[PDB]
Paper text:
Autophagosome formation is a fundamental process in macroautophagy/autophagy, a conserved self-eating mechanism in all eukaryotes, which requires the conjugating ATG (autophagy related) protein complex, ATG12–ATG5-[name] and lipidated MAP1LC3/LC3 (microtubule associated protein 1 light chain 3). Here, we demonstrated that [name] plays a key role in recruiting the [name] complex to phagophores during starvation-induced autophagy. Crystal structures of [name] bound to the coiled-coil domain (CCD) of [name] revealed the recognition mechanism between [name] and [name]. [name] is a novel [name]-binding protein (RBP) that can induce [name] proteins to adopt active conformation without nucleotide exchange.
We prepared the [name](141–265) complexes with GDP-bound [name](30–218) or GTP-bound RAB33BQ92L(30–218). Their crystal structures were determined at 2.4 Å. To our surprise, both GDP- and GTP-bound [name] adopted the same conformation in the complexes. Structural comparison of GTP- and GDP-bound [name] molecules in complexes with [name] revealed that their conformations are identical with an alpha-carbon root-mean square deviation (Cα-RMSD) of 0.16 Å. The conformations of GTP- and GDP-bound [name] complexes remained identical at the switch I and switch II regions, where the major conformational changes are typically observed in different nucleotide binding states. [name] binding induced a remarkable conformational change of the switch I region. This results in a ca. 8.4 Å translocation of the Cα atom of I66, followed by a hydrophobic packing of I66 against F95 of [name] and W194 of [name]. The switch II region is largely disordered in GDP-bound RAB1A, while the switch II region of [name] adopted the active conformation and formed extensive interactions with [name]. Therefore, [name] induced conformational changes of GDP-bound [name] to hold it in the active conformation. Importantly, E186 and R193 in the other molecule of the dimeric [name] contributed to the stabilization of the active conformation of GDP-[name] via hydrogen bonding with R94 of the switch II region and the main chain of the switch I region, respectively.
Residue numbers in the entry:
A (entry chain B), B (entry chain A): 30 to 204
C (entry chain D), D (entry chain C): 140 to 225
Write the structure that this text describes.
Amino acid sequence: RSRIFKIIVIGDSNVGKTCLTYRFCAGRFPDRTEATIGVDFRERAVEIDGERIKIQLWDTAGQERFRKSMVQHYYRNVHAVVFVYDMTNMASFHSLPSWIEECKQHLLANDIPRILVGNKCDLRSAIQVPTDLAQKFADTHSMPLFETSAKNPNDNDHVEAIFMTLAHKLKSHKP
Amino acid sequence: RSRIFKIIVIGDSNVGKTCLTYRFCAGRFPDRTEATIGVDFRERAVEIDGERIKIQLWDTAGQERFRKSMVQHYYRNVHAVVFVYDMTNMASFHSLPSWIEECKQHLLANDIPRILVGNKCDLRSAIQVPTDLAQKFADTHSMPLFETSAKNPNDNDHVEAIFMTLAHKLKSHKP
Amino acid sequence: MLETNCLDLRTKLQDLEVANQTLKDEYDALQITFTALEEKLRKTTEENQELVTRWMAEKAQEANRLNAENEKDSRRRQARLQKELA
Amino acid sequence: MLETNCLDLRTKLQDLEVANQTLKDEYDALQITFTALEEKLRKTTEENQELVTRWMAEKAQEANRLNAENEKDSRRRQARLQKELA
Ligand SMILES: Nc1nc2c(ncn2[C@@H]2O[C@H](COP(=O)(O)OP(=O)(O)O)[C@@H](O)[C@H]2O)c(=O)[nH]1
Ligand SMILES: Nc1nc2c(ncn2[C@@H]2O[C@H](COP(=O)(O)OP(=O)(O)O)[C@@H](O)[C@H]2O)c(=O)[nH]1
Ligand SMILES: [Mg+2]
Ligand SMILES: [Mg+2]
C-alpha cells in the first residue's frame, strides 16, 4: 500500500539542500556537510489520511562537475520539484531562472508541482533577498514561496510543514 | 537463516583479487577493473553436504592509501584468509611476509585457516615464480598452495575448486 | 675604488664566475624540476578526474536502480488498484 | 676571424651582454611561474586527499555495518538453536 513520492531538490551549492532534506528526514541538523556529489537519497515514511506514504527526497548536486551525467536520472518520473536559494545570497536567487529552464527542458509532463524555498531565514542581519521580491518571482512562476531555516526548524515556515504540505497536495492531487 | 563464512582476500595491488572474487561469485571475468578502494564485498550461496552457506568474500585493498584504518574491519570475526600473489610478478610474491605479519598481528584466534594463491597461471611465457619456491613457502607456513587463473578458470587449480574446498573445510572444521 | 684601474679586472674574473654559477646552468636546472613538477601536477589532476568520474558513475547507476524500483512498485500499485474495480 | 682585433672583441662583448639579459629575463619569468605551479599542485593534491579520505570513511562505515549485521545474524541463528532445545 505504501506508495512513493519522488521529490527532487535543486539549487546552487551551499544554499542548504543537504541540511534541509536531512532536517526533514532525520529530524536534526547535520554535524557537518560536504559537497554533494551526484546525488543523495533521503527517505521518510509518513501517514496521510491513513495511507502510508514514502517521501523520497533527492538532494541533488549544484556543482556542474558533480551533476554532469545525472540530470536525466533526477528528472525521470519525478513527482515534484523543490527549488532552493540562500536568503543571504542574492546570487543564489538570480540563479533560479537557469534552474527553472533546466527543469522545463527536462520535465516529461506538464502537471508536476514546483515550489520555491528560501533557506537560512535565521540569519536575519545578513538577508539579501527581500520577501516581496521572492514572492513576486514565485507568484509569476506559479510556485508557492516558503522562507525557512533548516538550522532552526520552527522559524517562520516550519521545515516540517513545507514537505508535509507538498506531500498532502500530491496525495490528494489537489491544487 | 543460513550460516555466513567471512573470507578475506589479501595481497598486492594488481595480482587479481577483484577478478578472482568476482570470478567465483558471479561466474565471469570482469569487463574492466579499477583500483579497489577500501574493500568490495561479493557473496555467493552454495550448498555443502546439505547445508546452505553464504560465502562472503572481502576483496580488500592492497594500496596503503586505500586501506588506511580498514585493517581492523577486515580482520574482525574473519573465518578464513586468502593470500594472493601474481605468478608473473616476483615482487608480489616477496610481499607475502609483510602481509602475513599483518595477519598474525591482527588475528584474534589461533585456529583461522590461511591459504596461498598464485594467480594468472594462464600467462605461462611470463611466469616469474616457480612452483617449487611457492610450494616451499606455503608448506613452511602451513598453507596449501593453489596455482590458478581468474581469466581461464579451468586451468591448473580451478577457481571454483579453491573456494569450494576452503568452504568445505570451514563447514567440516577439518584439516 | 674611487678611481678604477686595470687591476680592477679582478671584477671580470669575479663576474664571469658568479653569473655562471647560475644562469645557463640554473636555467636547465630549473627547467628539469619544472617539467618534473608539470608531470606531477598532470598526474594528480588526472587522478582527481578518474576519482570524480568513478564516483559519478556509481551515483548514476544507483539513481538508475532506484528509478527502476520506484517504477516497479508503481506498476504494482496500478495492478492492485486494477484488482480494486473487478 | 684569423686575427682578432678590438672591434671584434667589443662586438662579441655587446652581443654576449645582450644574450645575458635575455636569458636573465627568461630565468626570472620562470623562477616564479614555478612558485605558482607549486601552489596549483598543492591545491590539487589537497582536493585529491579530501576525495580519498571521504571515500575511505564511507567504506569504513560500510565494513563496520556489515560486521555488525553478520554478528547479529549469527546470534539470531544461535537464538533459533535455543528455542528448539526446549
Ligand atoms: N544559519 C544557517 N545555516 C545553514 C542552514 N542550512 C544550511 N546551512 C549552512 O550552509 C552551508 C551549506 O549547507 P549544505 O546543506 O551543505 O548546502 P547544499 O550544498 O545546498 O546542500 C553549511 O555550512 C550549513 O551548515 C540554515 O538554515 N541556517
Ligand atoms: N591474464 C590474466 N590477467 C588477469 C588475471 N586476473 C587478473 N588479471 C588482470 O590483472 C589486472 C588487475 O586485476 P585486478 O583484479 O583488478 O587486480 P587487484 O588489484 O588485485 O584486484 C587486470 O588487468 C586484470 O584483467 C588472470 O587470471 N589472467
Ligand atoms: Mg552539500
Ligand atoms: Mg582491484
